[PDB]
Design a protein around this ligand. Structure first.
Ligand SMILES: CCCCNC(=O)N1CCC(C)CC1
Ligand SMILES: CCCCNC(=O)N1CCC(C)CC1
Lengths: 193, 193
């Protein structure tokens, strides 16, 4: 069954907790999944292609949850709306730190990964700008910055800040504090004059 | 004269505009500086060590300018103070995009570079938190987030946002708009309730 593919994906994710991809081998991957090295190469052309697929799953999972969120409005409080949105990325990527970590590094080498970050970031920034615009129309938010430019910076702040937190980088916001920090900065940049 | 070292530094920076370090060679570096490959190795043990030195110069230049700024206060306007601070990093790194670009990528491989970003970021975040605290004491800023946590996120936003702008990443704030965007988000997160 294809589900050997499922087995390669789980072997990889597991191993990426312990060491970078560079220090992970196709032997290591095939072994974990309980297939031969040549049977591995039937399912994925490279180690790098396996990362890509994982990052794709994680990214689409985040996207899907944000689509679920947008199709029903949680009963009022503007701050809570934002907190609930940003939580989608905190939880989704926070459940996949290993993948999140390797994906981000791979952006410097794998334009195929870079393109995948880029696509999904553009989409999410577009969604951010539409909510700010909608909020500006209702009269709740002042027309300050260009909405899309503001949305871009805010999304970039969240990419950088969440992943530094996840990787325990120095410096970083503690993970148990990161959510409140971003929301404060989001709400206050969106609604403030 | 050592100033062969100066010549290796300028050859490298020049070339890093055209191609990544990976595609740049010690031959290329020695040639540009007008020395032999073995004379090169007297001055720097690797290509990677040359990057490091450049990033060090650029980082200290930014730091020094921020020290100049702090030792005399520009006549009032809280927003302008911040704009003037952030401008230091916009101008300094914006004059060294090639170096800025290669330094950032090298963080994923060269813990010696990672450590250099880390050190200087910690310092700048500390300075940010001290200005917010000072501002909170004068009574001008509300005691909202922990000052250091806020300073960290804001600095990370600026690292991510400025370098995406510089590299023409999609997505990004246009460079001619990036300054205003960050300041708005800075001022409004610092002074807003
Ligand atoms: C509707 C609110 C969207 C919030 N966006 C958000 O949290 N992002 C921060 C995390 C990165 C990975 C994607 C963009
Ligand atoms: C006193 C204000 C400091 C502003 N900090 C700032 O603009 N930074 C953003 C750019 C990165 C490279 C370092 C931190």
């Amino acid at each position: 069954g294809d589900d050997r593919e499922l087995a390669i994906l789980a072997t990889a994710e597991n191993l990426l907790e312990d060491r970078p991809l560079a220090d992970i081998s196709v032997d290591d991957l095939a072994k974990g999944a309980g297939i031969s090295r040549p049977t591995f190469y039937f399912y994925f052309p490279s180690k790098e292609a396996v990362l890509l697929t994982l990052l794709d799953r994680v990214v689409n999972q985040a996207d899907m949850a944000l689509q679920t969120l947008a199709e029903n409005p949680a009963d009022t409080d503007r701050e809570n709306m934002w907190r609930t949105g940003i939580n989608v990325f905190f939880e989704t990527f926070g459940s996949h730190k290993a993948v999140t970590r390797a994906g981000q590094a791979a952006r410097a080498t794998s334009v195929e990964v870079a393109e995948l970050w880029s696509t999904f970031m553009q989409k999410w920034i577009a969604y951010t700008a539409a909510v700010i615009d909608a909020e500006r129309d209702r009269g709740a938010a002042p027309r300050t910055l260009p909405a899309h430019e503001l949305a871009t910076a805010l999304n970039l702040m969240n990419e950088r800040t969440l992943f530094a937190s996840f990787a325990g980088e120095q410096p970083s916001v503690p993970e148990a504090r990161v959510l409140d920090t971003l929301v404060h900065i989001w709400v206050t940049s969106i609604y403030g004059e």
